[PDB]
Amino acid sequence: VSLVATLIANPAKAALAPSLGIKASAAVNATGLYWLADDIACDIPLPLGMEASEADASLRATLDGAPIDVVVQEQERRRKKILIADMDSTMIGQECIDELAEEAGLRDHVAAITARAMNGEIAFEPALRERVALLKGLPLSVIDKVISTRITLTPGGPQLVRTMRKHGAYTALVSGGFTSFTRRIAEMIGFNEERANRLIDDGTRLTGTVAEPILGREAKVEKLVEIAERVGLTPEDAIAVGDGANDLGMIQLAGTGVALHAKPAVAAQAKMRIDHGDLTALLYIQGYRKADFVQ
Ligand SMILES: N[C@@H](CCP(=O)(O)O)C(=O)O
Ligand SMILES: [Mg+2]
170-178 and 193-197: which strand pairing?
Answer: parallel
Q: Does the active-site annotation cover 88?
A: yes
Going by C-alpha positions, the residue among 123, 125, 120, 115 that lies closest to residue 88 is 115
Going by C-alpha positions, the residue among 150, 154, 200, 149 that lies closest to residue 173 is 154
Ligand with minimal distance to 95 CA: 1
Q: Is 160 left (phi over 0), alpha (psi -120 to 50) or beta?
A: alpha
d(CA 173, CA 286): 19
Q: Which residue puts its alpha carbon closest to atom 10 of ligand 1?
A: 114
Going by C-alpha positions, the residue among 81, 79, 43, 75 that lies closest to residue 59 is 43
Question: How far away, in angstroms, is 79 Cα from ligand 2 center?
Answer: 24
* 8 Å CB contact between 264 and 56: no
Mention every residue, 6+ apart, whose C-beta is less than 8 A from residue 268.
none
User: Which of ligand 1's atoms lies nearest the C-alpha of 247?
Assistant: 6
Q: Which residue puts its alpha carbon closest to atom 7 of ligand 1?
A: 88
Going by C-alpha positions, the residue among 17, 277, 4 that lies closest to residue 159 is 277
Distances (CA, A) of 179 to 134, 190, 228: 18, 15, 22
* 8 Å CB contact between 264 and 274: no
Compute how many other C-beta atoms are within 10 angstroms of the C-beta atom of residue 264: 8
Compute how many other C-beta atoms are within 10 angstroms of the C-beta atom of residue 160: 29
* 8 Å CB contact between 138 and 104: yes
Going by C-alpha positions, the residue among 213, 236, 214 that lies closest to residue 225 is 236
Residue 247, annotated ligand binder? yes
Going by C-alpha positions, the residue among 228, 234, 281 that lies closest to residue 259 is 281
- Can you name the residues that pair with 201 across neighbouring β-strands? 206
Q: Look up residue 218 and give its amino acid.
A: E
Pocket of ligand 1 contains residue 128 by CB under 6 Å = yes
Question: How far away, in angstroms, is 19 Cα from ligand 2 center?
Answer: 36
Catalytic residue among 39, 64, 69, 86: 86
* 8 Å CB contact between 24 and 44: yes
* 8 Å CB contact between 3 and 270: no
- Can you name the residues that pair with 42 across neighbouring β-strands? 7, 35
Provide the 8-state DSSP code for 237: G
Mention every residue, 6+ apart, whose C-beta is less than 8 A from residue 43.
4, 5, 6, 33, 34, 36, 287
d(CA 211, CA 200): 6
Q: Is 228 exposed, middle or buried (0-12, 13-18, 19+ CB in 10 A)?
A: buried
Give the experimental resolution in Å: 2.1
- Terminal Cα distance for the chain, rounded: 34
d(CA 185, CA 179): 10
Length of the chain, in residues:
295
* 8 Å CB contact between 43 and 4: yes
User: Which of ligand 1's atoms lies nearest the C-alpha of 114?
Assistant: 10
Pocket of ligand 1 contains residue 182 by CB under 6 Å = no
For residue 209, the Cα-to-chain-centroid distance in whole angstroms is: 27
Question: How far away, in angstroms, is 88 Cα from ligand 1 center?
Answer: 5
